[PDB]
């Protein structure tokens, strides 16, 4: 144990924990949908 992280190791890790939370696949499809004005 007791692994020691530099500033960007620690930051990468913190960003993985606090990362944009996932959602249900139907909701994920809705967010991924490319609308008829985005060509």
């Amino acid at each position: 144990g007791s692994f020691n992280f530099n500033d960007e190791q620690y930051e990468e890790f913190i960003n993985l924990l606090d990362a944009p939370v996932a959602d249900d696949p139907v909701i994920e499809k809705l967010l991924a949908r490319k609308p008829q004005w985005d060509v």
Partner: protein, 149 residues
């Protein structure tokens, strides 16, 4: 083949807008601009390209949930409508896409916790269920979508 959503202005032509739900069509024509100016509700419209004729719209409004604990803020997706000329062409899901992403950005800046929907018909309810909204089992035709954080 339709323009990107833009905030409702007085220059948008909404007089000949027909969705199939007259309550929504009447709100747009008679209360859209007033609420835009009051800030009570924010309406976004899509137009036929190279025109200002409204093909579809939705309205976002701020609300709060209280217990009969300080109130919990939510976004109300008050309205979403497509003109009958554009029904079943995937525009309704394109507007819901835009509406939900917009509510994600609002959540990041003021911390609203969920999108709330009060469906008028039970067919409207199933439009939202089909796109990942959760149906309240303690209230009729009320749906929720949790927002990040």
């Amino acid at each position: 083949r339709v323009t990107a959503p833009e905030p409702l202005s007085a220059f948008h032509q909404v007089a000949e807008f027909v969705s199939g739900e007259a309550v929504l069509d009447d709100w747009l024509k008679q209360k859209g601009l007033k609420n835009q100016a009051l800030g009570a509700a924010r309406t976004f419209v899509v137009c036929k390209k190279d025109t200002k004729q409204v093909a579809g719209f939705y309205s976002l409004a701020t609300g709060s949930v209280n217990h009969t604990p300080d109130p919990i803020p939510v976004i109300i997706l008050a309205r979403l409508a497509v003109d009958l000329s554009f029904h079943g062409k995937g525009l309704g899901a394109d507007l819901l896409h835009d509406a939900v992403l917009r509510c994600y950005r609002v959540a990041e800046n003021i911390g609203v916790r969920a999108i709330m929907v009060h469906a008028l018909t039970e067919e409207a309810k199933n439009f939202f269920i089909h796109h990942g909204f959760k149906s309240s089992q303690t209230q009729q035709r009320t749906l929720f979508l949790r927002l990040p954080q």
